[PDB]
Design a protein around this nucleic acid. Sequence first.
RNA 1: AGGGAACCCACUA
Lengths: 406, 29, 66, 258, 115, 78, 141, 59, 44, 192, 51
Amino acid sequence: HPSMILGVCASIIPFPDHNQSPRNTYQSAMGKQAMGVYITNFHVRMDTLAHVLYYPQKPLVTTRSMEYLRFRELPAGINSIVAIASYTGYNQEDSVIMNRSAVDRGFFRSVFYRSYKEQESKKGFDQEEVFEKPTRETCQGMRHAIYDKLDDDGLIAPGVRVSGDDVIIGKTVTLPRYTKRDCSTFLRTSETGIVDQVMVTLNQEGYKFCKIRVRSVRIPQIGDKFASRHGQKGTCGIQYRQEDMPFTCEGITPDIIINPHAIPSRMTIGHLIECLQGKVSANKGEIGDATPFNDAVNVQKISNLLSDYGYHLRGNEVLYNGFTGRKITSQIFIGPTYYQRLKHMVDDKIHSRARGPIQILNRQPMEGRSRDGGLRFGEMERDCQIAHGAAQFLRERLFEASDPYQ
Amino acid sequence: DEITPDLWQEACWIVISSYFDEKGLVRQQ
Amino acid sequence: MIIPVRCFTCGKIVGNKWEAYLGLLQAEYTEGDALDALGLKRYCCRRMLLAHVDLIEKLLNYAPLE
Amino acid sequence: PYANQPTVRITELTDENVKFIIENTDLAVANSIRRVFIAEVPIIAIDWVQIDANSSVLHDEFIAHRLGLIPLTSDDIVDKLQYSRDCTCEEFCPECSVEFTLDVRCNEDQTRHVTSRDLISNSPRVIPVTSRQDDILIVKLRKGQELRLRAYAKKGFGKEHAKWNPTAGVAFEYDPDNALRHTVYPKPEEWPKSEYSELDEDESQAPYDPNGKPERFYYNVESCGSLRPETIVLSALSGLKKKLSDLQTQLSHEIQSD
Amino acid sequence: MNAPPAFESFLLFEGEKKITINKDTKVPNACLFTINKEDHTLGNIIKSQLLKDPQVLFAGYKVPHPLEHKIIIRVQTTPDYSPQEAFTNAITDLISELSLLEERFRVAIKDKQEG
Amino acid sequence: KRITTPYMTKYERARVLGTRALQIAMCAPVMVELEGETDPLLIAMKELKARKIPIIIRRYLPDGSYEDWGVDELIISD
Amino acid sequence: DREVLRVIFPTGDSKVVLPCNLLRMIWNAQKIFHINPRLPSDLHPIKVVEGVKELSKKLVIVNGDDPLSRQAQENATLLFNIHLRSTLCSRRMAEEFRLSGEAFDWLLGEIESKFNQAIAHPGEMVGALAAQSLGEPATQM
Amino acid sequence: LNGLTDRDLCELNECPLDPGGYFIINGSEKVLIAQEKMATNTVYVFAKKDSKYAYTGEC
Amino acid sequence: MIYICGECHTENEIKSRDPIRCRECGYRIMYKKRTKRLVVFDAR
Amino acid sequence: SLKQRLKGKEGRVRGNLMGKRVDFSARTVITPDPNLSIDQVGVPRSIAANMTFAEIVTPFNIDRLQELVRRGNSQYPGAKYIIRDNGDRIDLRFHPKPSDLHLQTGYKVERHMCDGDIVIFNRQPTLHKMSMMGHRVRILPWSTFRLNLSVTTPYNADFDGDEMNLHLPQSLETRAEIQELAMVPRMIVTPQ
Amino acid sequence: NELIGQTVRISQGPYKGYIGVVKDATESTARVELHSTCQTISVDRQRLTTV
RNA sequence: AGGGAACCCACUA
Ligand SMILES: [Mg+2]
Ligand SMILES: [Zn+2]
Ligand SMILES: [Zn+2]
Ligand SMILES: [Zn+2]
């Protein structure tokens, strides 16, 4: 069959011969970032990062090659009722308006797993590390945190909540009025969640070894990245409730509204064919076939099938304004499309600094958001601030806000 | 006798199904 | 993993219809006729049952911790 | 002195939906009624889950999220129930919440289906709707797994969370024959006629009425089970009237305190 | 992380004032009714009931930002009438219309339930 | 004798406004009658429009010499 | 001025880049003063000639009175003065634009103010401006 | 896990859908990415450009 | 402190500074039990 | 070696003197906002409650800054530090003894970034001088920077996952020169 | 300050019924991370109930 | 009230 020329990640694209080829490349890149159930024994694994979707659905429009990728068994995405409309301006320039009521009902909700590990490694007869709950009167250098979440073994228990300045593993190293130093493990800053599983074992070296899995539920929000299977990625721009969403005559509000302007320059016509075929599939009860090179499926046959179900044959519907109730003058293309929630969330990316840690050598702010570092005001930014003539802003960026010294 | 053009689209996916039934997807490794 | 309680779009209850849907599927109903017998008229609720992957059946194959 | 005089026809009244037609009202009134169906009709739903034990394969937020979406019979109780933010009790009292408990263990060698039948309330009239059909599955338990929890169901409306939405689908429609050209079809013959179209098969749209405004509005209010659909409509009209009355009281205070 | 609580759609926090009138001096006989913790549900009905009034020369509402919960209604009247009086009359007519609608709906429910 | 431009350049405007705003924030005597004003930038702008900022701009010619223009002597564009 | 233009632009391309959009400013003057183009004008042609002369005397790029500076001034505003005398011609101000006296006085003042706004500000980092202006379209190619 | 049924894999807390093909090195699952190279023992004739050699046949 | 064995699921009394192993099967992977604190979720 | 320390884009000169990590900078995903003016940027409350502007205490703002100090670092429209004339920093996150919350003229209060604050807002690659313009802070609920849609053309930005950087000017002089030189309305027409 | 680290219940106001552990407290205000949601809110100490 | 460096890899726009 000629559709065996595609690999694993391009075999999930419905109608890839109707797409411009860079968009197939982008979906092959972004199907690997899609959130689903990555493996069925995810409750046993202490992976450092894990992303499990609450309600993965298999696609309504499928290729025949996804029976062998096991995508029907471990799917990564949800069939979303997707209107292609300009609504209130919040889906412009590759954005998505989402239904807040759908998101409240579990639409694209997911759980994030972070795993932390510590070895209770004795290094000689001088420096001994112990899993124990530190106390102020005994341990030096405790980080002014909440230390009573820990149990008697120095390890936190499943079910406890933790914020970014909480300790989960209490580790003290004996010090050669303070017998030992605190070398405990805290969560990542600006993180939160429930302790999900604490596993205690011993490694090859025979030392006590813990892995603690912390779970946090990530509800979709503004700035979370969603993509279809046609390279049509975009952050959530706003979330409207069901009574603000546009609706059909039978009360169907779209889960997602994407911009019309995402289509013409990209020519993802397979996206529109997948919406049409998904409308036909959801009304018929079939799962549509979107195997690439098929003469049994063209747009006219899908249209005739759709018009057999009391719909417009081209998949448009008369939507009503959610705010005013008035009919929208244009008829809106709306139908079920498989969206993926990508691992690029905004709460994993938001970072600000005011003043904090500085590098030991050059006394400039640290590197990266994981250590409360600053952003590099680089050479091109310096060049642009030169072109502005803003000499004092350039001076405070490159002298006062990084490393003032005398 | 032979596979007619109407049975071909199911014959080819039967043989692809048999291929992936034995070989799987990480057979090279 | 398990069937959603409500349809995401409209909020119709579909969490009580999964085992009935599977019973109808075992009774040689076509999927569209099974969805019609369950009273799922809007295509938003039909894609809840039509596209559901019952992964909790796979997660029940592992012995519990306690 | 410029109030409308709207009439009502019920055309269908089942236990799961009411289909009705409102004549002689404005489009904004009709849309605000449709919006209050979805967003401002208060029902009872679980909003407080303590999980004493959860050995199931689904984590605790997953179970709690599923429990909040289970509809509870809110008829005749939600009206006399208080919002917990307004109630003077410390935590939860029978004047503002209904206490649910679930205690399921699976010791049988086959899979136990924790349904909404296993949710047991202390109030005998706020129960799961499916318990009052098939029951709503919360979790499936393996042998030795258990789920023990205590849940409180408070009063709220769908503008806060969608689990307090009483409706499944609020179908809304005006002018089915497009006599006002509120939507302009590029090809009117490609469009299926409405359920309420009065045109014969030959004609695609009604002739354009230049003097017309939307006057007749078609509703189909399906209920998810918490309230009867006619209770959804009557509670929505009462709630919209109450929002306008509260606004008028605040506006009277602001006018007389100028 | 920055998620507003779901109850700031509709709950006035302590010190927030439900409705304020601002007599804008740009044009005669006009007011700006800033209603807090409301949305299109009341803004649209108030706007349309004001548009039924023949002594109202302008009536429009806006949500300045959908991430905030605030309605600005601008009413302009003929000089022998005031925007505050127009707003009160519009709310009274809306209340009477909804009362009539509720009573006729109860009558219709009682007729169809019996038959 | 002063060959430089009689207009105040935008860089001069930005720096005079910043310097004067900082001076007002350090409790310099305001030159104009502020009417309920609190933010030093708006006070500096109001002083600049009134042509009352007590600052001399010293413009350096490339040959090394300078010209002293008072803010009140330069034409205020924005 | 025409022969000088023929030398400067030998391909006959008339599109230039100049500070004050004189045609739009004449249109602005027509709309501000409600210039009826069906009536005779009250604008003397010698007022046009003298006004353009005294306007050219104050569109100053090079400041000085020695012959080096006034030659550099005549060079620096050569095209703008050619364009200004072509556009504010006494025939075109009577046959075509039909401005009044007050409209013409406003037009002269507005040309002077817009030109003096167009002069480069000392301090401006034009080398970095040029480097970025030739650099970011290079990302496009 | 070779030749085990789905039930035996689920007894070992392994996923039956897991394909394998990787190594567990210090608890990290490590996959060997296939590296391409020129084929050995085959005579390839190229044109080295701007060089002292007009043609080059390597093996 | 109370740990659950990974494979035999038996409860284990484990003190501090003793090796991790099961009393029954000797399997060296142990899991802590769930906490006894008040855990409360809004059902959302 | 020392030569390897001094050379390259990562060396001392190019990587630590021409450009460097800075304090008072923020970065998050950008999402559209048609309701903002072209010179406004919608800022999350967590970014604004973490980024502080040092406001010098005058008799004009003794009371407002006293209230900001009284609210502290916990409440968002509040303050993080008091800097006395001698230069010590009273950290307001320890809720210190009430003798410290006294405000004299000449003190600096490091109040949280509030509405109307001027920021430089930037998208990499910074190609031309309209890739780095000035914006007025507007505080909006969720976790993204929010931009107007006409503004995405100079930034070469869209909302398919772009992140932009927000630098807060720390002085009145630099805030004034960003206001008078680099704001979005002044950057409408390019000299290019 | 004994309030820090104690599990607390909000007893008045819009957050009534929320559970959490106090992070930092004043005589009139505490920073309570909510058990129910992923937020650390500020709440007046008259509206808090220890447990 | 804050004790890591270096390299590699993957990724984002
Ligand atoms: Mg982009
Ligand atoms: Zn539905
Ligand atoms: Zn109560
Ligand atoms: Zn054991």
